[PDB]
Design a protein around this ligand. Sequence first.
Ligand SMILES: Cc1cn([C@H]2C[C@H](OP(=O)(O)O)[C@@H](COP(=O)(O)O)O2)c(=O)[nH]c1=O
Ligand SMILES: Cc1cn([C@H]2C[C@H](OP(=O)(O)O)[C@@H](COP(=O)(O)O)O2)c(=O)[nH]c1=O
Ligand SMILES: [Ca+2]
Ligand SMILES: [Ca+2]
Lengths: 132, 132
Amino acid sequence: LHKEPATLIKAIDGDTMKLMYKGQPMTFRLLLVDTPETKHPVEKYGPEASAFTKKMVENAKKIEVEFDKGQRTDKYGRGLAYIYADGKMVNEALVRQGLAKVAYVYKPNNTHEQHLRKSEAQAKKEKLNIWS
Amino acid sequence: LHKEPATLIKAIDGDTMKLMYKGQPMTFRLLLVDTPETKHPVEKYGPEASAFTKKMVENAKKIEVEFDKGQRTDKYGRGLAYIYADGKMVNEALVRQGLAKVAYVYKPNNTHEQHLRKSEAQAKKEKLNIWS
Ligand SMILES: Cc1cn([C@H]2C[C@H](OP(=O)(O)O)[C@@H](COP(=O)(O)O)O2)c(=O)[nH]c1=O
Ligand SMILES: Cc1cn([C@H]2C[C@H](OP(=O)(O)O)[C@@H](COP(=O)(O)O)O2)c(=O)[nH]c1=O
Ligand SMILES: [Ca+2]
Ligand SMILES: [Ca+2]
């Protein structure tokens, strides 16, 4: 796996954002996590998660995307990646805060599954947000 | 944020101590500050800060811990908190004396950041210890 540059266009919610990738606007969805819903007819913590992600990506010097080993886009045409803001994985950051659950683990896009799972466990142990 | 009871087990240095929290021994590290080093291969004021903290927590009737809004432990498994000795925040007391600098401000655990920064400013104006 390798990290590639991208440019933030717009934060959408906790786990979705619009990025400029290779000179094309693309919706990206975070691999291996689910932040709570705020669009589809609002879950508890859905708003917080969004704010968190929005802040984390807006404030970054650099945004990078890292595809996994399998599919790079979902059925909705969303890029599927691990996305890093100045080197800190957004996917992990959310989970570590109890603002996301590890979810949608579709092989073979599961390289960071164990890392994320352990962040989840700590968050759960610390009774943070979703786990509170 | 809410204050929770704990029991002193041992003062370690200026910004680290061992407490009994919910019936288990844990190392705790003070949020938002850094006292000078005395362990890792001895900075100026390190010994002074240790003594201050040790005195403040040993003489207390009650010790309380106050977690902030995010992570409750660091990578070393140390609890991250605002610690209060008879209602007095140890973190602030140190800063107020110029025995610690405000440091390691890692969002979102930054609730008392401003209060501490003001204490620091006064300690600096007064040319205390580290700022002397
Ligand atoms: C994270 C992820 C989501 N998805 C799909 C699964 C869900 O589709 P369905 O809605 O049709 O079940 C949806 C979850 O995304 P959201 O959490 O953005 O809704 O996106 C993937 O196909 N692969 C992925 O890796
Ligand atoms: C105060 C604090 C320290 N730490 C870490 C940062 C430093 O890690 P590194 O040692 O890996 O740089 C270390 C500083 O504490 P000390 O002053 O006890 O060294 O503890 C946190 O991760 N979060 C915190 O809130
Ligand atoms: Ca979601
Ligand atoms: Ca220190």
